[PDB]
Design a protein around this ligand. Structure first.
Ligand SMILES: O=C(O)CCCCCNC(=O)NC1CCCCC1
Ligand SMILES: O=C(O)CCCCCNC(=O)NC1CCCCC1
Ligand SMILES: [Mg+2]
Ligand SMILES: [Mg+2]
Lengths: 547, 547
């Protein structure tokens, strides 16, 4: 029967309620119970606070009008006011002290996820204070989670004016009955009922949620920890930079502050960071999820030489140049991690900080050649299978859907044996024609990769492996250097191709290296353990990057 | 005969020379003349500083090796060292104290402009100091002005090793003879001559320039103040954001820091900021030159309603949302300026600061209607000519090249009389079929606009004028508000459509409004007086925006 849920901002989706400061300020100052509340609502409909609530006057204009009402409310009550009594000072703390009621937001998100139209109905004001940005960020994080956001000072209407409620129904394109309205103020609830729609007086969150969980018939309370926000492609800013006459790199950009460049591995795309792009941004950073040369909307030239580390790095530097960025924090994974390590070893001046996921930094051996060193590792067998041009491409591009469904899998649901790849004569030789669905990705998420690789295919990516000798030589030039800039190495327990032990010596070359580890975590870190990853990176970013 | 110019970094393109600190530190500390210089070059070819110069070891690794040589150079010289003697501390100040030798850079730029292949040949090092970014920015600003940039620690070679010089010739794809090498060190010059190419020992800039001005036969010294850097389209990062299902805005992004959104006017494009995009970025900002809805690579739907201020602003807010930006400094011009004023009046929370060029903020008159108010102004006559759909489009899209060459003109070279436009029955009724070439734009710059408007045409732009009534009504809602956030109004003396006097009252609505004015400046501010504009905006940005 229900199909919509409307949440109030202050007191419901955000706490502590800004309206609640009035009372606290009173007791704290031992003022006549209500003295501040009265001056706040002096004039009812045709009152200053009402005007301010309808966008008639900015908040900075309201404050002075509010001060005077306190000089008269205290005058009639035969009382005074402290000498250090500042209305702005009071609301400033009150507003910045208001945080998102996480459990409530989660419940809202849940509803929407199970086919529900959410929306925020709040009596706000045009904030033009010198700290307005604070409130800005708040609403910025809440917006993206609700189908609608109706602001009083926006629509020129304010609760409980029955009109705005009509506006709501109209905006929700739904009849009252199929709507749930949550608010902490009773007055703002009556109207909702008078029109039909179910209401819920919100005092304490859990209680309200119970009523909600019931009236909606959907488990909201005591629910599992959900996955972090996963950005939607079509709603992302897409950027393009021409690094070379015939090489154009694509990237997804979100957030503001220190630039954090994310470099995915083989065979992925910028989408492999869908779980960290939002989080990192919200953390106060300018995430630049890349589309590494050869993948997605990035140029994918055939020439193998076009994919040797040296050239790859030079273009990344050019990328910084074209964008007007002196430095950048490089975070990689798989081949990406490899890329960032050499970004730090060859262009320190450009790296604010470097972080690798799974990929350990191992200095090339001046004596043994790559081919030899690789054959020395059974699990790297598959890398020999990637050498011959065409062979690997054939099998992988043969059935994209299968290819990705077979690769992107947890450590407990594998179906590919990198063991005797060459032996079997293929990567899928004994894999199902229609693998199950990895608990890490949905049917959709997979098809996204399918459509991407439909463009340039697997040639460009596979070339990253076809420059061992060159990459080797180039690296030998740095055997005398040392990573002395902020570095962080994150290891995956269940990664059976990039075992954590392969980095046990890293500190020898990277003295002040910090670390991270993720229990029961496969090779595809971002997908497998997105929460741990964000937590780990954000932690590291604030301590060693922001500086 | 000559066709190439190679400049050394330290001492030539940048001063004071970092190598020169050695001597100064000596005298300042009353140390044996050379004590520091010796320890610096102890070991010649197979020396620490040489290794550091060939990328064998990072700078942070070198410092310790340099310290010891001073503990031995002072030991043999029978002298000691102060207790607060720090090598890092000395080079830190020395490096950050090095600035771009402007007059030299200018001379280089001049050469290149007159068909010369420039390039930087310097013996640098991989900087991994905690202040590396400083050096990073320096080279970042120099790079873009030279065809090539050969770093010692990069190519593994170092001057005066005759090999690297060969590398140079090869990279310059030119024979010695047609090359000019400038350096402050004599030793680094001999090789150049031994191969042929002309050399110039650079002591004092003016002297070197004279020799250069001569040997090249091109006025370099005592030359006019040049125009600021004008970014090249193909070398800019292009971004796209979908604000609405069928509306996608395009923008050019450059720089890092506080986001500065530039909104052009009718009928331009993001290219109208070609002179401020670089400058502002270099000033420490993240410039986001826009492509206002209806222009260039931005969606241009036919529906007039699609261009009323309210919708235009809502999308700009959505633009911020999709990009993950809580706030942004909005700088507009012409219609753009109009847009930003209403961005501040309706979304203060989102505006870090607002600045308008030419366009004055005039609050709508509750009584008189737009149509009436406009007819009250002779010069606004043309605006009536834009009302009827199709008419205006016809004449303007008829000959793009002519249209833009007739519009974009200085205040002393006009050819269009907005006076009796309706009377004459056209905007070009009595204008030349092939106008001259405005001293503001080149033949090329013009064709860029031509190709842009070839896409969506003049329909979308012209619609900005076709929503007077709506824009009027909407604005009446803010008649009770006031711009109380950082604001800056820049007026153009010779603007005869947007006269400076039209803003004489602005302070009544914008109390703390700051101002700017530009002598003998036409309507197309950015093009006409780019230098003044940058100076003015950057000034305002650091004082009221960065905060
Ligand atoms: O666990 C599984 O079932 C499959 C894992 C497949 C990993 C592919 N990544 C890879 O080869 N990266 C290189 C990057 C450069 C260093 C060596 C590894
Ligand atoms: O000087 C010249 O020869 C030609 C100037 C042409 C100016 C066109 N700009 C314009 O109409 N802007 C509106 C923006 C909204 C307010 C009114 C002006
Ligand atoms: Mg409330
Ligand atoms: Mg020099």
């Amino acid at each position: 029967t229900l199909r919509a849920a409307v949440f109030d901002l202050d007191g419901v989706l955000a706490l502590p309620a800004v309206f609640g400061v009035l009372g606290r300020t009173e007791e704290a100052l031992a003022l006549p119970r209500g003295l501040l509340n009265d001056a706040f609502q002096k004039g009812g409909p045709e009152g200053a606070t009402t005007r301010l609530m309808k966008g008639e006057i900015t908040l900075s204009q309201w404050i002075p009008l509010m001060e005077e009402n306190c000089r008269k409310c205290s005058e009639t009550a035969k009382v005074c006011l402290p000498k250090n009594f500042s209305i702005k000072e009071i609301f400033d703390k009150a507003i910045s002290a208001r945080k998102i009621n996480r459990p409530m937001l989660q419940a809202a998100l849940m509803l929407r996820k199970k086919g529900f139209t959410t929306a925020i109905l709040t009596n706000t004001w045009l904030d033009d204070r010198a700290e307005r940005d604070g409130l800005a960020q708040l609403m910025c994080e809440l917006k993206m989670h609700f189908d609608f956001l109706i602001e009083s000072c926006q629509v020129g209407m304010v609760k409980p004016e029955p009109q705005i409620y009509k506006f709501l129904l109209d905006t929700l394109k739904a009849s009252p009955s199929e709507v749930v309205f949550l608010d902490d103020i009773g007055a703002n609830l009556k109207p909702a009922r008078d029109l039909g729609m179910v209401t819920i007086l919100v005092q304490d969150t859990d209680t309200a949620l119970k009523e909600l969980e019931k009236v909606t018939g959907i488990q909201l309370l005591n629910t599992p920890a959900p996955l972090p926000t996963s950005c939607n492609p079509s709603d992302m800013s897409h950027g393009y930079v021409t690094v070379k006459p015939r090489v154009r790199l694509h990237f997804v950009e979100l957030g503001s502050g220190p630039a954090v460049c994310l470099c995915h591995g083989f065979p992925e795309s910028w989408y492999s960071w869908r779980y960290q792009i939002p989080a990192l941004a919200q953390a106060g950073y300018r995430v630049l999820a890349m589309d590494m040369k050869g993948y997605g909307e990035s140029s994918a030239p055939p020439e193998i030489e076009e994919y040797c580390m040296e050239v790859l790095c030079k273009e990344m530097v050019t990328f910084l140049d074209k964008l007007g960025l002196s430095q950048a924090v490089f975070i990689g994974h798989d081949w990406g991690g490899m890329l960032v390590w050499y970004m730090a070893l060859f262009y320190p001046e450009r790296v604010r900080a470097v972080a690798s996921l799974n990929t350990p930094f191992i200095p090339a051996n001046p004596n043994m050649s790559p081919l030899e060193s690789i054959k020395a590792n059974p699990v790297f067998d598959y890398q020999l299978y990637f050498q011959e041009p065409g062979v690997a491409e054939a099998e992988l591009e043969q059935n994209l859907s299968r290819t990705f469904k077979s690769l992107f899998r947890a450590s407990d649901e594998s179906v590919l044996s990198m063991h005797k790849v060459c032996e079997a004569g293929g990567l899928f030789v004994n894999s199902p024609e229609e693998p199950s669905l990895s608990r890490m990705v949905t049917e959709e998420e997979i098809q996204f990769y399918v459509q991407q690789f439909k463009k340039s295919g697997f040639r460009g990516p596979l070339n990253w492996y076809r420059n061992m000798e060159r990459n080797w030589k180039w690296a030998c030039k740095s055997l005398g250097r040392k990573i002395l800039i902020p570095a962080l190495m994150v290891t995956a327990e269940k990664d059976f191709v990039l075992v954590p032990q392969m980095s046990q010596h890293m500190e020898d070359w990277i003295p002040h290296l910090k670390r991270g580890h993720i229990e029961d975590c496969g090779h595809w870190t971002q997908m497998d353990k997105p929460t741990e990853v964000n937590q780990i990176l954000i932690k590291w970013l604030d301590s060693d990057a922001r500086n």
